[PDB]
Design a protein around this ligand. Structure first.
Ligand SMILES: *N1CCC[C@@H]1[C@@H](c1ccccc1)c1cccc(OC)c1
Ligand SMILES: *N1CCC[C@@H]1[C@@H](c1ccccc1)c1cccc(OC)c1
Ligand SMILES: [Cl-]
Ligand SMILES: [Cl-]
Ligand code: NA
Ligand code: NA
Ligand code: NA
Ligand code: NA
Lengths: 227, 7, 227, 6
Protein backbone atom coordinates (compact mmCIF):
# COMPACT_ATOMS: atom_id res chain seq x y z
CA UNK A 1 0.00 0.00 0.00
CA UNK A 2 0.86 3.69 -0.27
CA UNK A 3 2.23 3.78 3.31
CA UNK A 4 4.31 0.60 3.05
CA UNK A 5 7.57 2.41 2.33
CA UNK A 6 7.20 4.88 5.21
CA UNK A 7 8.74 4.39 8.64
CA UNK A 8 6.33 3.61 11.48
CA UNK A 9 7.57 6.60 13.47
CA UNK A 10 7.11 8.90 10.48
CA UNK A 11 3.53 7.69 10.03
CA UNK A 12 2.79 8.44 13.70
CA UNK A 13 4.45 11.86 13.41
CA UNK A 14 2.43 12.70 10.30
CA UNK A 15 -0.79 11.49 11.95
CA UNK A 16 -0.14 14.09 14.66
CA UNK A 17 0.52 16.79 12.05
CA UNK A 18 -2.66 15.82 10.20
CA UNK A 19 -4.61 16.19 13.43
CA UNK A 20 -3.16 19.69 13.95
CA UNK A 21 -4.25 20.55 10.40
CA UNK A 22 -7.69 18.92 10.95
CA UNK A 23 -7.00 16.59 8.01
CA UNK A 24 -8.66 13.54 9.49
CA UNK A 25 -8.77 11.42 6.33
CA UNK A 26 -4.99 11.79 6.10
CA UNK A 27 -4.66 11.14 9.84
CA UNK A 28 -6.64 7.91 9.51
CA UNK A 29 -4.59 6.75 6.51
CA UNK A 30 -1.33 7.37 8.38
CA UNK A 31 -2.56 5.50 11.46
CA UNK A 32 -3.78 2.62 9.28
CA UNK A 33 -0.29 2.40 7.79
CA UNK A 34 1.19 2.40 11.29
CA UNK A 35 -1.13 -0.44 12.36
CA UNK A 36 -0.02 -2.41 9.28
CA UNK A 37 3.57 -2.42 10.51
CA UNK A 38 2.41 -5.19 12.82
CA UNK A 39 3.50 -3.81 16.19
CA UNK A 40 1.08 -3.21 19.05
CA UNK A 41 -0.16 0.36 19.46
CA UNK A 42 0.65 2.29 22.59
CA UNK A 43 -2.08 4.03 24.55
CA UNK A 44 -1.34 7.32 22.79
CA UNK A 45 -1.35 5.60 19.40
CA UNK A 46 -4.70 3.87 20.08
CA UNK A 47 -6.18 7.30 20.81
CA UNK A 48 -4.77 8.70 17.56
CA UNK A 49 -6.28 5.81 15.58
CA UNK A 50 -9.65 6.27 17.25
CA UNK A 51 -9.80 10.08 16.91
CA UNK A 52 -8.90 9.89 13.24
CA UNK A 53 -11.60 7.42 12.23
CA UNK A 54 -14.17 8.97 14.60
CA UNK A 55 -13.86 12.24 12.72
CA UNK A 56 -14.01 10.61 9.29
CA UNK A 57 -17.08 8.52 10.06
CA UNK A 58 -18.58 11.37 12.10
CA UNK A 59 -18.71 13.59 9.03
CA UNK A 60 -20.18 10.76 6.96
CA UNK A 61 -22.86 9.98 9.57
CA UNK A 62 -23.84 13.63 9.84
CA UNK A 63 -24.14 13.93 6.06
CA UNK A 64 -26.07 10.66 5.87
CA UNK A 65 -28.55 11.96 8.44
CA UNK A 66 -29.04 15.20 6.50
CA UNK A 67 -29.68 13.34 3.25
CA UNK A 68 -31.89 10.69 4.86
CA UNK A 69 -34.07 13.44 6.33
CA UNK A 70 -34.40 15.12 2.91
CA UNK A 71 -35.20 11.74 1.36
CA UNK A 72 -37.85 10.94 3.97
CA UNK A 73 -39.54 14.30 3.40
CA UNK A 74 -39.44 13.85 -0.39
CA UNK A 75 -41.20 10.51 0.13
CA UNK A 76 -44.09 12.49 1.68
CA UNK A 77 -36.39 11.86 -9.55
CA UNK A 78 -33.86 9.37 -8.18
CA UNK A 79 -31.22 11.96 -7.24
CA UNK A 80 -31.75 12.21 -3.47
CA UNK A 81 -31.78 8.43 -3.06
CA UNK A 82 -28.75 8.03 -5.33
CA UNK A 83 -26.69 10.54 -3.37
CA UNK A 84 -27.77 9.19 0.02
CA UNK A 85 -26.76 5.74 -1.23
CA UNK A 86 -23.38 7.10 -2.35
CA UNK A 87 -22.67 8.55 1.10
CA UNK A 88 -23.99 5.39 2.77
CA UNK A 89 -21.66 3.20 0.71
CA UNK A 90 -18.66 5.37 1.61
CA UNK A 91 -19.62 5.24 5.28
CA UNK A 92 -19.93 1.44 5.15
CA UNK A 93 -16.54 1.30 3.46
CA UNK A 94 -14.91 3.21 6.31
CA UNK A 95 -16.59 1.02 8.93
CA UNK A 96 -15.44 -2.08 7.04
CA UNK A 97 -11.89 -0.67 6.97
CA UNK A 98 -11.89 -0.11 10.74
CA UNK A 99 -13.44 -3.49 11.51
CA UNK A 100 -10.86 -5.07 9.22
CA UNK A 101 -8.00 -3.41 11.10
CA UNK A 102 -9.46 -4.56 14.38
CA UNK A 103 -9.94 -8.15 13.29
CA UNK A 104 -6.74 -8.56 11.24
CA UNK A 105 -4.29 -6.62 13.41
CA UNK A 106 -5.49 -5.29 16.76
CA UNK A 107 -7.92 -7.62 18.56
CA UNK A 108 -5.93 -10.33 20.32
CA UNK A 109 -6.34 -12.84 23.10
CA UNK A 110 -3.05 -11.89 24.77
CA UNK A 111 -3.52 -8.19 25.41
CA UNK A 112 -3.56 -6.17 28.58
CA UNK A 113 -7.11 -5.45 29.67
CA UNK A 114 -6.92 -1.77 28.68
CA UNK A 115 -6.18 -2.51 25.03
CA UNK A 116 -8.48 -5.53 24.77
CA UNK A 117 -11.45 -3.54 26.09
CA UNK A 118 -10.56 -0.48 23.99
CA UNK A 119 -10.58 -2.45 20.75
CA UNK A 120 -13.66 -4.56 21.51
CA UNK A 121 -15.54 -1.37 22.40
CA UNK A 122 -14.38 0.07 19.08
CA UNK A 123 -15.66 -3.03 17.28
CA UNK A 124 -19.02 -2.54 18.95
CA UNK A 125 -19.07 1.14 17.98
CA UNK A 126 -18.33 0.51 14.29
CA UNK A 127 -20.92 -2.24 14.05
CA UNK A 128 -23.31 0.22 15.71
CA UNK A 129 -22.55 2.77 12.97
CA UNK A 130 -23.28 0.11 10.36
CA UNK A 131 -26.52 -0.69 12.19
CA UNK A 132 -27.61 2.97 11.97
CA UNK A 133 -27.87 2.66 8.17
CA UNK A 134 -28.93 -1.01 7.87
CA UNK A 135 -32.46 -2.26 7.30
CA UNK A 136 -29.67 -5.12 10.47
CA UNK A 137 -30.48 -7.90 12.95
CA UNK A 138 -27.15 -9.61 12.33
CA UNK A 139 -25.21 -6.34 12.53
CA UNK A 140 -26.98 -5.48 15.79
CA UNK A 141 -26.00 -8.83 17.26
CA UNK A 142 -22.37 -8.34 16.16
CA UNK A 143 -22.29 -4.99 17.97
CA UNK A 144 -23.90 -6.54 21.05
CA UNK A 145 -21.43 -9.44 21.12
CA UNK A 146 -18.41 -7.13 20.91
CA UNK A 147 -19.69 -4.77 23.60
CA UNK A 148 -20.60 -7.72 25.83
CA UNK A 149 -17.14 -9.26 25.58
CA UNK A 150 -15.63 -5.87 26.41
CA UNK A 151 -17.99 -5.49 29.37
CA UNK A 152 -17.08 -8.92 30.74
CA UNK A 153 -13.37 -8.14 30.59
CA UNK A 154 -13.85 -4.66 32.07
CA UNK A 155 -15.80 -5.92 35.09
CA UNK A 156 -13.19 -8.60 35.85
CA UNK A 157 -9.98 -6.67 35.21
CA UNK A 158 -10.64 -2.93 35.73
CA UNK A 159 -11.93 -0.80 38.62
CA UNK A 160 -15.41 0.72 38.25
CA UNK A 161 -13.90 4.20 37.82
CA UNK A 162 -11.59 3.21 34.97
CA UNK A 163 -12.27 5.72 32.13
CA UNK A 164 -12.14 3.07 29.38
CA UNK A 165 -14.64 0.94 31.31
CA UNK A 166 -16.88 3.99 31.84
CA UNK A 167 -16.82 5.00 28.18
CA UNK A 168 -17.65 1.43 27.13
CA UNK A 169 -20.64 1.43 29.48
CA UNK A 170 -21.74 4.79 28.10
CA UNK A 171 -21.66 3.54 24.52
CA UNK A 172 -23.20 0.15 25.27
CA UNK A 173 -26.05 1.94 27.02
CA UNK A 174 -26.50 4.16 23.95
CA UNK A 175 -26.56 0.96 21.89
CA UNK A 176 -29.33 -0.43 24.08
CA UNK A 177 -31.36 2.79 23.88
CA UNK A 178 -30.87 3.83 20.24
CA UNK A 179 -30.24 0.57 18.34
CA UNK A 180 -31.51 -2.45 20.30
CA UNK A 181 -34.90 -1.04 21.42
CA UNK A 182 -33.97 -1.75 25.04
CA UNK A 183 -34.33 1.57 26.88
CA UNK A 184 -34.90 -0.09 30.26
CA UNK A 185 -31.56 -1.92 29.93
CA UNK A 186 -29.90 1.30 28.76
CA UNK A 187 -31.15 3.16 31.82
CA UNK A 188 -30.24 0.37 34.23
CA UNK A 189 -26.71 0.13 32.81
CA UNK A 190 -26.11 3.87 32.96
CA UNK A 191 -27.45 4.03 36.53
CA UNK A 192 -25.45 1.15 37.95
CA UNK A 193 -22.31 2.28 36.14
CA UNK A 194 -22.64 5.81 37.50
CA UNK A 195 -23.39 4.67 41.05
CA UNK A 196 -20.56 2.13 41.18
CA UNK A 197 -18.08 4.73 39.92
CA UNK A 198 -19.38 7.34 42.40
CA UNK A 199 -18.68 5.00 45.29
CA UNK A 200 -15.02 4.52 44.28
CA UNK A 201 -14.11 8.14 43.44
CA UNK A 202 -12.62 8.51 46.91
CA UNK A 203 -9.73 6.23 45.87
CA UNK A 204 -8.65 8.49 43.00
CA UNK A 205 -6.03 11.19 42.69
CA UNK A 206 -7.06 14.64 41.47
CA UNK A 207 -6.09 13.70 37.90
CA UNK A 208 -7.88 10.35 37.79
CA UNK A 209 -10.88 11.95 39.48
CA UNK A 210 -11.19 14.45 36.63
CA UNK A 211 -10.97 11.76 33.94
CA UNK A 212 -13.55 9.54 35.61
CA UNK A 213 -16.04 12.26 36.60
CA UNK A 214 -16.11 13.76 33.12
CA UNK A 215 -17.43 10.46 31.73
CA UNK A 216 -19.76 9.98 34.71
CA UNK A 217 -21.22 13.39 33.85
CA UNK A 218 -21.93 12.15 30.33
CA UNK A 219 -23.67 9.08 31.75
CA UNK A 220 -25.77 11.33 33.95
CA UNK A 221 -26.62 13.58 30.99
CA UNK A 222 -28.01 10.57 29.16
CA UNK A 223 -29.86 9.32 32.25
CA UNK A 224 -31.52 12.69 32.81
CA UNK A 225 -32.39 12.90 29.10
CA UNK A 226 -33.95 9.43 29.14
CA UNK A 227 -35.82 9.75 32.46
CA UNK B 1 -29.81 10.48 18.78
CA UNK B 2 -28.51 10.16 22.34
CA UNK B 3 -24.87 11.30 22.57
CA UNK B 4 -22.08 8.69 22.68
CA UNK B 5 -18.53 9.16 23.98
CA UNK B 6 -17.06 12.27 22.31
CA UNK B 7 -13.66 10.66 21.82
CA UNK C 1 -14.98 12.57 -16.40
CA UNK C 2 -16.59 10.48 -13.66
CA UNK C 3 -19.67 12.71 -13.95
CA UNK C 4 -19.98 12.31 -17.73
CA UNK C 5 -22.90 9.88 -17.53
CA UNK C 6 -25.07 12.02 -15.23
CA UNK C 7 -27.63 14.54 -16.48
CA UNK C 8 -26.68 18.19 -16.06
CA UNK C 9 -29.83 18.91 -14.05
CA UNK C 10 -29.11 15.95 -11.77
CA UNK C 11 -25.57 17.23 -11.14
CA UNK C 12 -26.91 20.68 -10.15
CA UNK C 13 -29.49 19.08 -7.86
CA UNK C 14 -26.81 16.92 -6.20
CA UNK C 15 -24.47 19.90 -5.84
CA UNK C 16 -27.19 21.58 -3.78
CA UNK C 17 -27.72 18.44 -1.68
CA UNK C 18 -23.98 18.18 -1.10
CA UNK C 19 -23.95 21.79 0.09
CA UNK C 20 -26.76 21.03 2.56
CA UNK C 21 -24.76 18.03 3.84
CA UNK C 22 -21.55 20.12 4.05
CA UNK C 23 -19.88 17.73 1.58
CA UNK C 24 -17.93 20.33 -0.33
CA UNK C 25 -15.62 17.96 -2.21
CA UNK C 26 -18.72 16.24 -3.57
CA UNK C 27 -20.28 19.62 -4.33
CA UNK C 28 -17.23 20.68 -6.32
CA UNK C 29 -17.09 17.40 -8.24
CA UNK C 30 -20.78 17.73 -9.16
CA UNK C 31 -20.28 21.33 -10.28
CA UNK C 32 -17.20 20.32 -12.30
CA UNK C 33 -19.36 17.69 -14.00
CA UNK C 34 -21.99 20.31 -14.76
CA UNK C 35 -19.44 22.74 -16.21
CA UNK C 36 -18.03 19.97 -18.41
CA UNK C 37 -21.42 19.54 -20.10
CA UNK C 38 -20.34 22.59 -22.11
CA UNK C 39 -23.32 24.88 -21.44
CA UNK C 40 -23.16 28.34 -19.88
CA UNK C 41 -23.82 28.66 -16.16
CA UNK C 42 -26.53 30.83 -14.68
CA UNK C 43 -25.64 33.29 -11.94
CA UNK C 44 -26.86 30.85 -9.29
CA UNK C 45 -24.76 28.07 -10.82
CA UNK C 46 -21.62 30.24 -11.03
CA UNK C 47 -22.06 30.96 -7.34
CA UNK C 48 -22.44 27.24 -6.60
CA UNK C 49 -19.20 26.54 -8.48
CA UNK C 50 -17.34 29.27 -6.61
CA UNK C 51 -18.67 28.30 -3.17
CA UNK C 52 -17.83 24.64 -3.67
CA UNK C 53 -14.23 25.16 -4.75
CA UNK C 54 -13.62 27.96 -2.25
CA UNK C 55 -14.58 25.60 0.56
CA UNK C 56 -12.25 22.92 -0.79
CA UNK C 57 -9.27 25.17 -1.48
CA UNK C 58 -9.90 27.18 1.67
CA UNK C 59 -9.50 24.09 3.80
CA UNK C 60 -6.30 23.20 1.97
CA UNK C 61 -4.90 26.74 2.33
CA UNK C 62 -5.60 26.73 6.06
CA UNK C 63 -3.95 23.33 6.49
CA UNK C 64 -0.97 24.45 4.38
CA UNK C 65 -0.59 27.53 6.57
CA UNK C 66 -0.69 25.40 9.75
CA UNK C 67 1.96 23.05 8.39
CA UNK C 68 4.13 25.85 6.99
CA UNK C 69 4.08 27.50 10.42
CA UNK C 70 5.17 24.27 12.12
CA UNK C 71 7.86 23.95 9.46
CA UNK C 72 9.20 27.48 9.98
CA UNK C 73 9.45 26.88 13.73
CA UNK C 74 11.12 23.48 13.33
CA UNK C 75 13.82 25.30 11.35
CA UNK C 76 13.38 15.19 10.40
CA UNK C 77 11.87 15.56 6.93
CA UNK C 78 8.30 14.68 7.92
CA UNK C 79 6.89 18.21 8.36
CA UNK C 80 8.23 19.28 4.98
CA UNK C 81 7.01 16.07 3.33
CA UNK C 82 3.50 16.47 4.69
CA UNK C 83 3.41 20.18 3.84
CA UNK C 84 4.46 19.24 0.29
CA UNK C 85 1.68 16.62 0.13
CA UNK C 86 -0.96 19.17 1.08
CA UNK C 87 0.66 21.68 -1.29
CA UNK C 88 0.44 19.26 -4.23
CA UNK C 89 -3.23 18.60 -3.51
CA UNK C 90 -3.96 22.33 -3.34
CA UNK C 91 -2.10 22.85 -6.62
CA UNK C 92 -4.21 20.07 -8.16
CA UNK C 93 -7.45 21.75 -7.11
CA UNK C 94 -6.32 25.12 -8.45
CA UNK C 95 -5.21 23.53 -11.73
CA UNK C 96 -8.66 21.91 -11.96
CA UNK C 97 -10.47 25.22 -11.46
CA UNK C 98 -8.17 27.03 -13.88
CA UNK C 99 -8.80 24.30 -16.43
CA UNK C 100 -12.57 24.78 -16.19
CA UNK C 101 -12.17 28.54 -16.63
CA UNK C 102 -9.90 28.12 -19.65
CA UNK C 103 -11.94 25.20 -21.11
CA UNK C 104 -14.18 26.99 -21.68
CA UNK C 105 -16.09 29.16 -19.19
CA UNK C 106 -14.32 32.45 -19.88
CA UNK C 107 -14.56 32.35 -23.65
CA UNK C 108 -18.20 31.17 -23.58
CA UNK C 109 -19.40 33.73 -21.02
CA UNK C 110 -22.32 35.52 -22.59
CA UNK C 111 -22.38 38.79 -20.65
CA UNK C 112 -19.85 41.15 -19.10
CA UNK C 113 -20.80 40.29 -15.52
CA UNK C 114 -20.10 36.58 -16.02
CA UNK C 115 -16.90 37.26 -17.97
CA UNK C 116 -15.56 39.48 -15.18
CA UNK C 117 -16.66 36.93 -12.57
CA UNK C 118 -14.65 34.19 -14.31
CA UNK C 119 -11.58 36.31 -15.08
CA UNK C 120 -11.51 37.43 -11.44
CA UNK C 121 -11.78 33.78 -10.43
CA UNK C 122 -8.82 32.99 -12.72
CA UNK C 123 -6.78 35.68 -11.02
CA UNK C 124 -7.84 34.34 -7.61
CA UNK C 125 -6.82 30.77 -8.35
CA UNK C 126 -3.45 31.82 -9.78
CA UNK C 127 -3.09 33.89 -6.61
CA UNK C 128 -3.71 30.77 -4.49
CA UNK C 129 -1.01 29.02 -6.51
CA UNK C 130 1.31 31.99 -5.98
CA UNK C 131 0.99 31.68 -2.19
CA UNK C 132 2.72 28.27 -2.32
CA UNK C 133 4.91 28.68 -5.41
CA UNK C 134 8.62 29.42 -5.48
CA UNK C 135 11.26 30.61 -7.89
CA UNK C 136 10.62 30.99 -11.61
CA UNK C 137 7.28 29.16 -11.39
CA UNK C 138 6.09 31.75 -8.87
CA UNK C 139 7.09 34.58 -11.22
CA UNK C 140 5.13 33.05 -14.10
CA UNK C 141 2.11 32.45 -11.87
CA UNK C 142 2.21 36.05 -10.62
CA UNK C 143 2.25 37.36 -14.19
CA UNK C 144 -0.67 35.07 -15.07
CA UNK C 145 -2.70 36.30 -12.09
CA UNK C 146 -2.02 39.94 -12.95
CA UNK C 147 -3.01 39.43 -16.59
CA UNK C 148 -6.32 37.79 -15.67
CA UNK C 149 -7.15 40.45 -13.09
CA UNK C 150 -6.23 43.24 -15.50
CA UNK C 151 -8.43 41.83 -18.25
CA UNK C 152 -11.32 41.69 -15.78
CA UNK C 153 -10.58 45.29 -14.76
CA UNK C 154 -10.65 46.51 -18.37
CA UNK C 155 -14.03 44.85 -18.99
CA UNK C 156 -15.61 46.05 -15.74
CA UNK C 157 -14.64 49.68 -16.39
CA UNK C 158 -16.19 49.58 -19.87
CA UNK C 159 -19.33 47.60 -19.03
CA UNK C 160 -20.20 47.99 -15.33
CA UNK C 161 -20.94 51.02 -13.15
CA UNK C 162 -18.36 51.76 -10.43
CA UNK C 163 -20.71 50.59 -7.65
CA UNK C 164 -21.36 47.19 -9.25
CA UNK C 165 -20.61 44.59 -6.52
CA UNK C 166 -18.79 42.22 -8.88
CA UNK C 167 -16.58 45.07 -10.08
CA UNK C 168 -15.92 46.12 -6.48
CA UNK C 169 -15.01 42.59 -5.40
CA UNK C 170 -12.64 42.25 -8.34
CA UNK C 171 -10.84 45.44 -7.31
CA UNK C 172 -10.71 44.18 -3.72
CA UNK C 173 -9.05 40.92 -4.71
CA UNK C 174 -6.71 42.52 -7.27
CA UNK C 175 -5.58 45.00 -4.63
CA UNK C 176 -4.95 42.10 -2.22
CA UNK C 177 -2.89 40.46 -4.99
CA UNK C 178 -0.79 43.62 -5.39
CA UNK C 179 -0.15 43.88 -1.64
CA UNK C 180 0.21 40.25 -0.52
CA UNK C 181 1.64 38.58 -3.63
CA UNK C 182 3.28 41.08 -5.99
CA UNK C 183 5.03 43.19 -3.29
CA UNK C 184 3.38 46.28 -4.82
CA UNK C 185 1.75 48.07 -1.87
CA UNK C 186 1.55 51.37 -3.75
CA UNK C 187 -0.43 49.73 -6.56
CA UNK C 188 -2.64 48.03 -3.96
CA UNK C 189 -3.39 51.30 -2.17
CA UNK C 190 -3.91 53.28 -5.39
CA UNK C 191 -6.33 50.68 -6.75
CA UNK C 192 -8.33 50.34 -3.54
CA UNK C 193 -8.49 54.12 -3.12
CA UNK C 194 -9.58 54.87 -6.69
CA UNK C 195 -12.19 52.12 -6.49
CA UNK C 196 -13.49 53.43 -3.17
CA UNK C 197 -13.78 57.02 -4.40
CA UNK C 198 -15.45 56.20 -7.71
CA UNK C 199 -18.07 54.03 -5.98
CA UNK C 200 -18.65 56.60 -3.24
CA UNK C 201 -19.64 59.21 -5.84
CA UNK C 202 -22.64 57.11 -6.92
CA UNK C 203 -23.88 55.69 -3.59
CA UNK C 204 -26.80 58.15 -3.63
CA UNK C 205 -28.25 56.71 -6.86
CA UNK C 206 -28.62 53.23 -5.31
CA UNK C 207 -31.63 51.55 -3.71
CA UNK C 208 -27.74 47.94 -3.62
CA UNK C 209 -26.47 50.56 -1.19
CA UNK C 210 -26.06 47.77 1.38
CA UNK C 211 -24.19 45.54 -1.09
CA UNK C 212 -21.79 48.20 -2.38
CA UNK C 213 -21.12 49.73 1.05
CA UNK C 214 -20.28 46.28 2.44
CA UNK C 215 -17.52 45.78 -0.11
CA UNK C 216 -16.37 49.40 0.25
CA UNK C 217 -15.75 48.68 3.92
CA UNK C 218 -13.71 45.63 2.93
CA UNK C 219 -11.60 47.97 0.78
CA UNK C 220 -11.38 50.37 3.73
CA UNK C 221 -10.22 47.68 6.16
CA UNK C 222 -7.37 46.80 3.83
CA UNK C 223 -6.48 50.48 3.34
CA UNK C 224 -6.35 50.97 7.12
CA UNK C 225 -4.15 47.90 7.55
CA UNK C 226 -2.03 49.16 4.64
CA UNK C 227 -1.89 52.87 5.59
CA UNK D 1 -5.06 40.76 4.14
CA UNK D 2 -8.58 39.44 3.55
CA UNK D 3 -10.05 38.87 0.12
CA UNK D 4 -13.74 38.80 -0.80
CA UNK D 5 -15.45 36.47 1.73
CA UNK D 6 -17.50 34.62 -0.88
N1 LIG E 1 -12.17 8.79 22.35
C1 LIG E 1 -11.85 7.27 22.45
C2 LIG E 1 -10.37 7.18 22.10
C3 LIG E 1 -10.02 8.35 21.54
C4 LIG E 1 -11.02 9.45 22.18
C5 LIG E 1 -10.41 9.92 23.49
C6 LIG E 1 -9.02 10.58 23.39
C7 LIG E 1 -8.67 11.37 22.33
C8 LIG E 1 -7.41 11.94 22.29
C9 LIG E 1 -6.48 11.72 23.32
C10 LIG E 1 -6.83 10.94 24.38
C11 LIG E 1 -8.09 10.37 24.42
C12 LIG E 1 -11.35 10.93 24.17
C13 LIG E 1 -11.39 12.31 23.80
C14 LIG E 1 -12.25 13.17 24.43
C15 LIG E 1 -13.10 12.67 25.46
C16 LIG E 1 -13.04 11.32 25.79
O1 LIG E 1 -13.84 10.77 26.80
C17 LIG E 1 -14.97 11.57 27.18
C18 LIG E 1 -12.17 10.45 25.15
N1 LIG F 1 -18.21 34.68 -3.24
C1 LIG F 1 -17.89 34.77 -4.76
C2 LIG F 1 -18.99 33.93 -5.41
C3 LIG F 1 -19.48 33.14 -4.44
C4 LIG F 1 -19.35 34.03 -3.09
C5 LIG F 1 -20.55 34.97 -3.04
C6 LIG F 1 -21.91 34.25 -3.05
C7 LIG F 1 -22.10 33.06 -2.40
C8 LIG F 1 -23.35 32.45 -2.44
C9 LIG F 1 -24.41 33.05 -3.13
C10 LIG F 1 -24.22 34.23 -3.78
C11 LIG F 1 -22.97 34.85 -3.74
C12 LIG F 1 -20.49 35.89 -1.81
C13 LIG F 1 -20.98 35.47 -0.54
C14 LIG F 1 -20.91 36.30 0.54
C15 LIG F 1 -20.33 37.60 0.40
C16 LIG F 1 -19.85 38.00 -0.84
O1 LIG F 1 -19.29 39.27 -1.03
C17 LIG F 1 -19.42 40.16 0.09
C18 LIG F 1 -19.93 37.15 -1.95
CL1 LIG G 1 -24.70 10.29 -6.56
CL1 LIG H 1 3.52 12.77 3.46
NA1 NA I 1 7.46 -1.83 3.84
NA1 NA J 1 -36.54 -5.24 34.41
NA1 NA K 1 -35.12 14.39 32.83
NA1 NA L 1 11.32 12.57 12.47
Amino acid sequence: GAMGSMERASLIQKAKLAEQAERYEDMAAFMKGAVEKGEELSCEERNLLSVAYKNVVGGQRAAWRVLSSIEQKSNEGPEVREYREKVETELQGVCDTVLGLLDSHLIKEAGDAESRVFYLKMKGDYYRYLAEVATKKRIIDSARSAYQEAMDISKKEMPPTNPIRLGLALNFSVFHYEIANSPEEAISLAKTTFDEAMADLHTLSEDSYKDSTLIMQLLRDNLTLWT
Amino acid sequence: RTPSLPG
